[PDB]
């Protein structure tokens, strides 16, 4: 899991050219993630290695197994110049050799990251859903005068490129979600878009299981407990499984609302599908308060235990 950062004295040049290349649909191959990290070390740290090595961003990516490698080259203005000299970067070298690159203003890194952040809220549902959402949200930020993206970023062709970059990059998505959740005033104006989108990504693909959980929990004199019917012998397997799945999620700590968007490990058994008895009981309990667990279909053989949970939540 080696990630190459690029280190030059004209970082802003180098960076905006990586953005040009991403916007042009050029495939950076294995240099993608270290391209995108290299960006990020600017919107947040001026290419200062020392300030980056102390951030909670760097600690998490190391705790996740990443190790950063560095291309020191001081005297070079083009992204072209920082690509290592290997046959396997030839077709990338070729594409970069011919690419468009206008003079680049500094809002642009930030502007780019803000735009990527708009795909998060529905990323896990697929391209169509991530793109229609992001397009509705461009309308809100444009209308607020917060930003106007270039009009050509708003085509489905361009948007598909960006969505695929997001699916492809763990690091990109994580920088966004972290800086998202730790914003107060932000690094700059582009940061509050990121936070707002990231706020709307919270429990994406974890909302139904989250709800089922909520409704199998009861208040008591002696603290918060599981509901009595959950602690019976017919539910013992499901409870043990659910708990192990739930314990896997809680390893992700503050990033656990974003586990599925980040594809974090150990959440494969958090489908509410797998716990039909627990789904029934949450339903029973929800209906008495009186929610409708939307997406929780209660199969017909578990209907009695739903009733049991409902009748006894009123009692």
């Amino acid at each position: 899991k080696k990630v190459i950062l690029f280190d030059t004295n004209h970082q802003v040049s180098i960076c905006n050219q990586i953005i040009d290349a991403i916007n042009s649909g050029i495939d950076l191959g294995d240099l993608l993630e270290g391209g995108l990290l290299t960006l990020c070390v600017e919107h947040y740290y001026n290419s200062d290695k020392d300030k980056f090595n102390t951030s909670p961003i760097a600690k998490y990516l190391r705790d996740a197994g990443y190790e950063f490698d560095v291309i020191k080259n001081a005297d070079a203005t083009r992204f072209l110049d920082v690509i290592p000299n290997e046959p396997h970067y030839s077709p990338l070298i070729l594409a970069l050799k011919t690419l468009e690159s206008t003079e680049s203003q500094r809002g642009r890194i930030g502007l780019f990251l803000s735009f990527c952040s708009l795909f998060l809220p529905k990323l896990v549902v697929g391209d169509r859903a991530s793109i229609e959402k992001a397009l509705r949200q461009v309308t809100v930020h444009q209308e607020q005068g917060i930003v106007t993206y270039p009009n050509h970023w708003l085509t489905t062709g361009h948007m598909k490129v960006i969505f695929g970059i997001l699916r492809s990059s763990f690091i990109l998505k994580f920088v966004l979600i972290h800086q998202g959740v730790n914003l107060v005033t932000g690094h700059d104006a582009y940061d509050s878009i990121i936070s707002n989108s990231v706020g709307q990504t919270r429990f994406s693909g974890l909302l139904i299981v989250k709800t089922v959980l909520e409704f199998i929990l009861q208040k008591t004199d002696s603290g918060v407990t599981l509901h009595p019917l959950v602690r019976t012998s017919k539910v013992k397997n499901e409870v043990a499984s659910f708990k192990q799945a739930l314990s896997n999620l809680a390893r992700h700590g503050e990033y656990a609302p974003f586990a599925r968007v980040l594809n974090l490990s150990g959440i494969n058994n958090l489908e509410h599908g797998l716990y039909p008895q627990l789904s029934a009981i949450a339903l029973g309990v929800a209906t008495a308060h009186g929610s409708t667990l939307a997406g929780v279909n209660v199969g017909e053989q578990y209907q009695q235990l739903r009733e049991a949970a409902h009748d006894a939540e009123v009692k």
Binding site: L206, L213, E214, K219, V224, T225, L226, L246, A250, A288
Partner: peptide, 26 residues
């Protein structure tokens, strides 16, 4: 079930704020 402060609990179980086996047993 009440208070809709359950959401605070349930989310805490999910982000490791509320110890799990306190609710679910060892």
């Amino acid at each position: 079930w009440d208070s809709s402060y359950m959401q605070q609990v349930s989310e805490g179980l999910m982000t490791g704020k509320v110890p799990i086996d306190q609710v679910f047993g060892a």
